[PDB]
Design an enzyme around this catalytic site. Sequence first.
Site, short mmCIF file in Angstrom:
data_model
loop_
_atom_site.label_atom_id
_atom_site.label_comp_id
_atom_site.label_asym_id
_atom_site.label_seq_id
_atom_site.Cartn_x
_atom_site.Cartn_y
_atom_site.Cartn_z
N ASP A 67 0.82 -1.22 0.00
CA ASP A 67 0.00 0.00 0.00
C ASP A 67 0.85 1.28 0.00
O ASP A 67 0.31 2.39 0.05
CB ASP A 67 -1.00 -0.02 1.17
CG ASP A 67 -0.38 -0.18 2.55
OD1 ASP A 67 0.45 -1.10 2.71
OD2 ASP A 67 -0.73 0.60 3.45
N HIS A 68 2.19 1.11 -0.09
CA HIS A 68 3.20 2.16 -0.11
C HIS A 68 4.15 2.01 -1.30
O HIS A 68 4.89 2.95 -1.60
CB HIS A 68 4.02 2.13 1.20
CG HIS A 68 3.20 2.32 2.43
ND1 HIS A 68 3.19 3.52 3.11
CD2 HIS A 68 2.39 1.45 3.08
CE1 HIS A 68 2.37 3.35 4.14
NE2 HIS A 68 1.86 2.12 4.15
N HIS A 140 7.50 -0.80 13.56
CA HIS A 140 6.46 -1.33 12.66
C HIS A 140 6.56 -2.85 12.39
O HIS A 140 5.73 -3.41 11.67
CB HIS A 140 6.40 -0.51 11.35
CG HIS A 140 5.21 -0.80 10.48
ND1 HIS A 140 3.91 -0.71 10.96
CD2 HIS A 140 5.17 -1.18 9.18
CE1 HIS A 140 3.13 -1.06 9.95
NE2 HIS A 140 3.84 -1.33 8.85
ZN LIG Z 1 2.62 -1.01 6.65
ZN LIG Z 2 0.48 1.25 5.34
#
Ligand SMILES: [Zn+2]
Ligand SMILES: [Zn+2]
Length: 307
Positions: A67-68, A140
């Site tokens: 998504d990046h 993360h």
């Molecule tokens: Zn992520």
């Molecule tokens: Zn993300």
Amino acid sequence: MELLFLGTGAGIPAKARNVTSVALKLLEERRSVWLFDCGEATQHQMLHTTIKPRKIEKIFITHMHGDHVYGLPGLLGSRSFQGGEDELTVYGPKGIKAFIETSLAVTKTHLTYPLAIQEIEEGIVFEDDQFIVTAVSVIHGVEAFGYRVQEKDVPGSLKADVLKEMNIPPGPVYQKIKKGETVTLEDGRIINGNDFLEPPKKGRSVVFSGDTRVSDKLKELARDCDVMVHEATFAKEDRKLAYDYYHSTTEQAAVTAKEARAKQLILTHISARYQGDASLELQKEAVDVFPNSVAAYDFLEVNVPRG
RNA sequence: GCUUCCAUAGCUCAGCAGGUAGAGCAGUCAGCGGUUCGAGCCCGCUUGGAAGCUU
Ligand SMILES: [Zn+2]
Ligand SMILES: [Zn+2]
């Protein structure tokens, strides 16, 4: 210096919000645009804006999540197809080189411009006379980063009226005085440039957090910055969901901007769970802690003013 | 629709790392805002022309 938000959505694309991608407009500053994460359909969102693929100089990637990144091979390809000439620099964690090269070789894509892929690590990622970009490791799970675009202090305005009054006519010698150089005038007069210059103006700073848990390293990275673009996937209520999924709440992003002494906070990477009406609730949840909070939506444009 | 080059004394196109307009003839440098000490030149945007548009 402007911040055009192309995608404010978390994980999977929605009709309201497309996946993560923030553009840093530097047209006046350096005639270019800098991208912060390039999720799928970034190029598609770009078609509804004044930003053109050829205008992009560098793309900074926080982490390897789809998504990046899934917007990278399409955006790079289109830039070459639009007639891209100038260099493009992709900054990202370990894996970005494998992803770009494979996705471009199998598709039989030959770029009409130079492509530099820099596999970054914590410290200075890019530095020159105008800007200094520093990356810092964030919580993360996967190898993730937090960026800071720091505009280096600009030299103060020329006291031109003082030069004009002193029988110094406007000409090519004025740009030399602006630099501070000791110039030898046409009639044999020595003048120090620094004496006819106003105090230097402090440079602007934008911080892109990416996907992360509440981080002290991120608070230190965003010290006294103009705009802190922090991710707030969940609400105050969903605190336990944020920890287990390696994310931050609206309240958590607000505490960070408060302690970092940031001027403005922009909440991005918002969950599809919350709608257009629910977005205001998230913004008010952050406003109670940090008053200058804005919950970002697709196509939002925020100007970064100087001091 | 997109992306890239053209618009300057009623009319041929001259212009320079951005230094305060150079000629042939009976100067709101297309508009506006910005950057700059200063814009024809740089960045926007709004108008009128021309040419590409295969991952
Ligand atoms: Zn992520
Ligand atoms: Zn993300």
